[model samples]
Target: PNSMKNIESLFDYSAGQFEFIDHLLTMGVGVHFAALIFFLVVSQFVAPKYRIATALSCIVMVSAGLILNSQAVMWTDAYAYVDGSYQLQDLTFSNGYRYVNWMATIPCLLLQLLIVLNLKGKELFSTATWLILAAWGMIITGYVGQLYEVDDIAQLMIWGAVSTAFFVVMNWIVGTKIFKNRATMLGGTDSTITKVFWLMMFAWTLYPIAYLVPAFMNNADGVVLRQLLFTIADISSKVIYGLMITYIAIQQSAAAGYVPAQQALGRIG
Candidate 1:
């Protein structure tokens, strides 16, 4: 009902192990909260067109920070320290909220590509609409797969493969359309966009791998490794990705000799 109420954990965790997981989750909390300020401040330096991209990046940071906060808090709440061991409570930890966060943030993250590329008329709307649709579709199917996480391995794989179909279509566009639009960017088009493309591939690929981790191990510490994987991917795809895009926008704005951007960088005063 609530989309997998809690991650199934039947194994006990040592004091150190429990703290380790807590720290990883709270560490994610710090990354996004710090990134939020950076995005808001940096958005002022880019042109209005590119500001839209940075602004969306700001949205990603806020959503991720809130969700990470919930993950950390809920995790701590779901366990009790009993005789030097972390004991699972009636309300076990849930990764369900991250799905909702992904649903809100992923399309915004992907749409930034279209904004930075400065597409308009048909290419912009056409690509933006489809990617938004596919992003939801991909995450929903993956969410369904994750529901089967503690129950049926076969169902999980089947749903994941269905979700990956959307993933393939989405990346095909990134490969063909977004990359094709790279030359239209202001400066260092090849170098900058290639970084975006590869960072996306490397970061996005980690999702399915981590999704399947519980299926493989299905243990207490498997949850630990899974949280680490999720946190790393989230930081890469959101924080690092946003930073790179902001840099590109600044580089382009400054190279175009826009007075405001030049001033922002202290190049003119």
Candidate 2:
């Protein structure tokens, strides 16, 4: 009862506060609007040669954000289905919508990979990208496992173990390669970029353990652990992943000397 009360406090639903809090939440939305304006202004001052590339990079980021949003909506619905309250009709609706987002992820990932390949030294293509790609495979495997729950616990355990191992290995390789390479190229190992990479790696490291530990222990806490692992995974995938890609885009822009804005006074085009 005490723990449930603590969880309830986390929600904090006061009807009287909703009007004020809702307005405050809009301020969060306003920040994105302000960021867009700032980017536009800054780009206009940047060199003209880089303007188109910068715009394209922004477009890619925005598109990925939309995909992430769509996926989140779908996954929330999926959880509803998992809870056994919803029927097949609701589940199917969510599954179709979610699959669209999933399909979109493939092209987006490929496009980002190509961007890195093009901007960075193609000769320096790391096997880490492959690992990241394989992480997606693990995510799919997990999604499948959720649907394919069987009577044979042993088979389920084996499948989960295999998928989780692949995920851990993938994240370890990708995180090490990206952060190490970026650290070397950018002239410092202590940047926020490196931190973001490692944070994601740590999140990935938590995921397999969270799932498998629960499987073996069969404790009530296992569900909570799974939820925690998933929350971190979502954060790493959507938030950190987006920011890291943006950092890469910026670094790539710097490397290519592509200025988005028309230079004023003493600027050589």
Candidate 3:
């Protein structure tokens, strides 16, 4: 009993058990695939006028998120070396991980803040506003943890913010104007283009929230919950609203008007 207790105490829930880690990865993959299907559908059925812009925007966001996540993973590897045992205060800043984090995340975050400020629309407050606000709040909180070496609260707030943001952005971008406070960027509702715009926004937002959330949340049990919440958010967003965006994309592309060779020949003849 004594030996088991000691081992259990040392078992860092922050790192997570191998099985749990595997489960988390698997869940991520599942969410990714589900999102893919949704994107496909929305792109096909939605109208043209609004599709490209939204998709492009979303793509940009997703790419940025992936890049940031890569930096975070490197940082986590470095942290493994320190193992929270000795305080190498000098090594802390010099550490490759810290550098990766600063380089990867700071720029994107600054840019996002700028974008949000520039992009005007009172309705922006709906999901997008809340998502960004939550994200910023979580990020600030995470930094506080690092500064004070308080791991628990940092992890909690970070993940919570991430999960909330994921839901907010995805739904706002993908779902129909069900929540629309005004006419869309496109003139009317139910246009293929409009749906794509929203879907792209949905897909694009997912990347950043997923990547950054983990970095802030890093303790073992905390990470697990974060992962689960992210997965749930992703799935919920996908099943419910992701299709609308994809349908818009596809529909818009079709609306652009492609001429068949036979039809062209007949017209010429």
Candidate 4:
């Protein structure tokens, strides 16, 4: 009977699971490449010094996205047998690479925000370092949870809780302190910054929820749901956030009287 059959049968190759994974990987690569092109073009056109940081942020994001998506493809293919059924067993099919990607990209992301804020010296260095460390803490803890099997569910939840706490603290610092100070500096309001900040904050909230899904659901459903959720989150966090950063760069460049070709022509003349 269907009830007695292996759960892996539900994800048979002919059933389109592999195709779905392939499609997602293609989309991830395409989107990241597009963003990379956009950032490179912007960096080239903008005033040489002013736009470099934003461009760097986009580059890191694109790199991370490419690696993360590729890791996802590998992770989907890596499974273990359990009770005569295939399962994405812990540690073996772990998403550690994704966290590694995050460790590299998240700091770049924070640096972009700080650059836009015009932070300098120790203020910039300290804040960026602290936030990056916090991000690493969150991701590493979550990775630890992912490596644990069902028999160690309690240990998994403890790590999940630790990661969640780090996330909460990280967001609080960014949303309340960092953003507030930046807005205050920018004449008490910068609508573009505010919008991007909130968008990131909201999108980031989904990650912890997705991380917890496996604790409650069956392996197949949990894997699919987490992948879908993470795909959306990555799109929002990296691509969408990068676009918003580009918009901010454009606004800043315009405010600084740095026109694209016109500025270059002026310098040449």
Candidate 5:
């Protein structure tokens, strides 16, 4: 009857594990909806140039979260392992859905930064292209690493390292050159743009740390911890970061003496 007990234990564990995943999905959906509403409200208060970007950031983020939740549902029903590890159809232990979500959202996040900076002409096009490429490089390399064979986890680490290098280079250019040059041109560091850029850099610094969790730990433990850390980072980078961008938009619009059409007409009349 010892084997029977073992089988029963396995069944109970699977049931409990899926319950927790259900809870996670529910909470994720809730947070995503809340962020969506928050960003939508804030978008109206910001200047016209920033409104669309802020609105789209919220839309993309919530959609990504929903996609992730749907993938989790499918995984729990069809592909989840008894050991709590997930894998792609290629039989590799990885979360392909989460990575797909990152691919969609990361570019949107960077676009918000670029728009707020008000880059234009050749400088705008070049910087925007580089930042998007770097963002894609970081996410794609990490996804490739996740799909690496079990016997070749070191390859995963190497790819992760490469992605980190890309991240550092991107940060260096944005923080040192783009932001500094823009601030100088604006005539002072006391502006909303300066503060927004620094806050974005600070929030973004958490991503690489979260990305390395899987490389340093066992797959099962790494999965849980990585999910938790990435969720936190996502909230920080997308929701909080987007809100700050909206704040800057409002500040800049106020400084520019922006007035509502009705208000301007009333004053003129």
Candidate 6:
């Protein structure tokens, strides 16, 4: 794993140490897979104009689910029970898969925002071009930083700051370019829109905070806590975030006089 050290593998372990992380990973998979069906089934409730966001949400769930399933497998394969203890084996458990999965999903995640905001023509094209660039800029810099997780704090700080700088760019885009119209977008969907904005900011912040964990502590407990935070971030950023988008799409479609969107809100109500 040249991309990053499998810090968990460099240590000896016990089943007890991993009990919670393992359970958390399994739960992560369950929620992600379950949400896939939720996203797909709920897509029909939105109008055609807003359906793209909901459809994209389904793809995000599947990507998250598949990666988590792979995470679970690699986690299991990395340890073997021997002499009354679980220890490292032929395969090292790298959190790299999470990064790889994010590369696929994050761009789509941001693209949904462009659709939901109803950006058009040159505005949509250019915003999306810049936004997608910023998306991978954040992830790639962060990934490079993680490669130094085991020993190089300076590299971590440098690339981490670079990564965070891109996040600020993303935040600026979302805050100023998009949410500047929060009050009137879809005829004043402020309550849901405001929550959606804050939730996204909060979850995005958590990833860097969680990334900082290995910087200080490189042990079982650190790994456990780090994994736990990632799980929480994923659930919030993807599941809750997507649901909020769904609600906004529902409202936006209803505002446009879409019959099914109006009725779906009534049904949900």
lDDT of each: 0.82, 0.44, 0.38, 0.67, 0.61, 0.82
Q: What is the TM-score of each candidate against the true structure?
A: 0.94, 0.51, 0.39, 0.81, 0.76, 0.95
lDDT of 2 by residue, 35-60 (tens): 43444444544344334433443444
Model 3 TM-score, all chains together: 0.39
Off by over 4 Å in 4: 1-14, 72-93, 182-189, 261-269
**lDDT score, candidate 6, position 25:** 87
Model 5 steric clash total: 0
TM-score of 1: 0.94
TM-score for model 5? 0.76
Which residues of candidate 6, in runs, are more than 4 Å off? none
| Residue 97, candidate 6: alpha-carbon lDDT | 73
lDDT by residue (1-269, candidate 1, tens digit) is 44243344666788887888889888988998898898898777898767788898888888888888887887788778988788877464667778767888988888887777767778888988898888888999988788778777899899999999999899888768767887777867557887898999999998888888877878777877888889899999999999988888877787777667778778634
Task: Name the top TM-score candidate.
Answer: 6
Give the alpha carbon lDDT tens digit for every residue of 49-80 in model 5: 65666776787767767875775565455434
lDDT (Cα, tens digit) per residue for candidate 4, span 32-126: 87778778766755554348666765677677767866665554565444455444433323455677678778878877877776677898788
Candidate 2, lDDT over the whole model:
0.44
Count clashes in each candidate, considering only residues at least 3 apart in sequence or on different chains: 0, 4, 22, 0, 0, 0
Q: After TM-score superposition, what is the CA distance of residue 158 in candidate 2 from its true location, in Å?
A: 1.6
Error of 6 at 20 (Å): 1.9
